[PDB]
Structure formats: C-alpha cells, structure tokens
C-alpha cells in the first residue's frame, strides 16, 4: 500500500535510495539554526509593541528596528549540520526546493542558491532602497556596517531608507512562494520538515499541499503538524498512519543519523568541517 516499508527513519532512508524518490522538498524553521547561536528572534516609545516589525512604522521611525538589529546581530554566520545536509541533498541531485521561514541567511552560506530557495519570510541577505523608482540593492556587508555604526541606512542614489528584504507585518508574502508551491508540490516525492512547529500560516498548510502518497519526515525536538483537537495533518501514531514519521531530537543529530543510514556521514562531516574551517578563517 505505502511507499515506506516502515514508519521509521530506516524506511525513509530506504525510500530515499529507491528509484521512487527523486525530488525532496525541505520545509525548515527556527529550529535548524538554534545550534548555530541564532535563537528564536521573534525607549523607542512604540505605539504598540508590534510596530517595530510593521512596515508603516518602520518607514516612519526605522531607528528602533536597527537598534534591535544591532542588539540581535550574530557574532558569526556559521550554518549547522542540518544546513549542510540540505547542501548535500543538492549535491546528490535530490533537492527540488527548500522553503524556509528563517531570515538568517544560513541557507545561502551553506551553498543553497536562490533557485533552490523559497524564503517565505524574506531574508537579511539582501536589502533594497524603499523608493519604488529606485530599488537599489545592497549587500549584507553594507547593511552590517550601517547597523554597527548606528547610522540609519540610506540609499546612495536617492537618499531613501534602505530596508532588509524581510517580510514586515503589513507586507505581502513573496509571489515566488505561491508560484513555486503550485509547481513544486505536483512533483515532490518526500517532504522533509525540520525545526518548525508548523503553527504559523500559511507556511504550515504547505504540508497539506503534498500528494497523499508523499512520505513526510519530521526532524524536530517535539512532534508537530498533527491536527489540532480544538480547531491533511500529520498522522504519526494512529492505526491509519501510513506515511508520516517523526524523529524527535536535535536537527543536527537527526540529519547525522539520516546521513549515516544513507552512507553520507563521512561526506557530511568533511563538508561541514571544511566549510566551518573556511568561515573561522575569515
């Protein structure tokens, strides 16, 4: 009946190395970056505490946002074992797409390219002048220098405010999300959900966009995605369970176990160690 021979990580690895599994979509959240030192990120006289992340207030008073940005700026941008496992998926020719709710750029530092990524909530990687007639793009280095010097970032062409490409409250989701969703989920063979509680919509509903036969593996500290008894959910434990698997623990250790099952543990170790060595050497 089912594509997985058993509702275990071993069954998922066997399915992955079968000829049936060619296209893997990753859905990742804050949990895949806590081991990197980036925790769950989410005087100025704010009218309401959400104003610091609402677009209108930012364009009126951006200084609070950038003060918070200096306070939260990471001491290092070192992706995790999980990030590099996704890079390995890319190298092995199995990665259809990575949908991320994170803005910390670690997916790109790990070697995932823009075509590989749907950054559902944007990113700090790129910033743009807020003027529609200009839209000058600035890199993260420029923005970091502005934030650390405590100088509000202004466009060099038109002197307008420059905003990191994260999706503020009152901004729309990137259209790439919907277009890529409509195409990708016709093609997915395996859904790999890592480090997210699947509570924020519409990113959570993504799991219901997979075909009914598509196996779905959750690597997370706690079970998530099951239908809420109060209000296509994950079914790990019922007698009708057939495709959903939960590996409970650190995302790094779950990806290590999966790589070991796949025979990739040495490749993953070498990749992580060389990339971390190059980051430390900057």
Ligand X SMILES: Cn1nc(C(F)(F)F)cc1-c1ccccc1CO
> Which positions lie near ligand X, rule CB under 6 A?
38, 41, 65, 68-69, 72-74, 104, 124
* Residue indicated by tokens 């990191």: 164
Query: Among residues 84 and 124, whose Cβ is nearest to ligand X?
Result: 124
Query: If contact means CB under 5 to 8 A according to the sort of partner, which of Zn ion, ligand X, ligand NAD, none does residue 257 touch?
Result: none
154 binds Zn ion (CB under 5 A): no
34 is in an annotated binding site: yes
CB 219 within 8 A of CB 52: no
103 binds ligand NAD (CB under 6 A): yes
Indicate the length of the chain as a whole number.
282
Q: Which of 52, 251, 255, 268 binds ligand NAD (CB under 6 A)?
A: 251
Q: Which of 250, 259, 261, 272 binds ligand NAD (CB under 6 A)?
A: 250
3-state helix, strand, coil in the chain (%, to 5): 40, 15, 45
Query: If contact means CB under 5 to 8 A according to the sort of partner, which of Zn ion, ligand X, ligand NAD, none does residue 65 touch?
Result: ligand X
Q: Which of 8, 131, 152, 226 binds Zn ion (CB under 5 A)?
A: 131
30 is in an annotated binding site: yes
Closest distance between ligand X and the C-beta of residue 69, in Å? 4
The structure tokens listed for 85 are: 């496992």
The enclosing H or E element of 192 equals strand 190-194
Closest distance between ligand X and the C-beta of residue 199, in Å? 19
Query: Among residues 57 and 77, whose Cβ is nearest to ligand NAD?
Result: 77
42 binds ligand NAD (CB under 6 A): yes
Question: Which active-site residues does the annotation give?
Answer: 121
Between 52 and 91, how does the x/- string for binding to ligand NAD read (CB under 6 A)?
Answer: ----------------------------------------
Query: If contact means CB under 5 to 8 A according to the sort of partner, which of Zn ion, ligand X, ligand NAD, none does residue 160 touch?
Result: Zn ion
**Between β-strands 216-220 and 244-248, what pairing exists: parallel, antiparallel or unpaired?**
parallel
> Going by C-beta distance under 8 Å and a sequence separation of 6 or more, which residues neighbour residue 201?
none
Residue numbers after which the chain is interrupted (C to N above 2.5 A) read 42, 231
26 is in an annotated binding site: no
Query: Among residues 21 and 268, whose Cβ is nearest to ligand NAD?
Result: 268
Sole window of 35-43, 45-53, 134-142, 271-279 interacting with ligand NAD (rule: CB under 6 A): 35-43
Long-range contacts, 7-11 (Cβ 8 Å, 24+) = 7/236, 7/241, 7/242, 7/243, 7/244, 7/245, 8/245, 9/217, 9/245, 9/247, 9/254, 9/257, 9/258, 9/261, 10/261, 11/245
Query: If contact means CB under 5 to 8 A according to the sort of partner, which of ligand NAD, Zn ion, ligand X, none does residue 199 touch?
Result: ligand NAD
* Residue indicated by tokens 């959903």: 244
**Of 168, 202, 162, 161, nearest to 185 (Cα)?**
202
- Dihedral pair phi/psi, residue 56, rounded to 5°: -60, -50
Closest distance between ligand X and the C-beta of residue 112, in Å? 16
């Amino acid at each position: 009946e089912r594509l997985l021979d058993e509702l275990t990580l071993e069954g998922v690895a066997r399915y992955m190395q079968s000829e049936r599994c060619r296209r893997v979509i990753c859905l990742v959240g804050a949990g895949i970056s806590t081991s990197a030192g980036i925790p769950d990120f989410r005087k100025y006289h704010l009218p309401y505490p959400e104003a610091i992340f609402e677009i209108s207030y930012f364009k009126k008073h951006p200084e609070p946002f950038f003060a918070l940005a200096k306070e939260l700026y990471p001491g290092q941008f070192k992706p995790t074992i999980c990030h590099y496992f996704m890079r390995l998926l890319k190298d092995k020719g199995l990665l259809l797409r990575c949908y991320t709710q994170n803005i910390d750029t670690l997916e790109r530092i790990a070697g995932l390219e823009q075509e590989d990524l749907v950054e559902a909530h944007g990113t700090f990687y790129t910033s743009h002048c807020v003027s529609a007639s200009c839209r000058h793009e600035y890199p993260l280095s420029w923005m970091k220098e502005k934030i650390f010097s405590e100088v509000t970032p202004k466009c060099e062409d038109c002197q307008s405010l420059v905003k990191p490409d994260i999706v503020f409250f009152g901004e729309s989701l990137p259209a790439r999300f919907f277009s890529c969703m409509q195409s990708d989920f016709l093609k997915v063979d395996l859904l790999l959900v890592m480090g997210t509680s699947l509570q924020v919509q519409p990113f959570a509903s993504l799991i219901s966009k997979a075909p009914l036969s598509t196996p779905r593996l959750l690597i997370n500290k706690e079970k998530a995605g099951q239908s809420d008894p109060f209000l296509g959910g994950m079914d790990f434990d019922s007698k009708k369970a057939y495709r959903d698997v939960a590996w409970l623990g650190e995302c790094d250790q779950g990806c290590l176990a999966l790589a070991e099952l796949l025979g990739w543990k040495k490749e993953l170790e070498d990749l992580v160690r060389r990339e971390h060595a190059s980051i430390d050497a900057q």
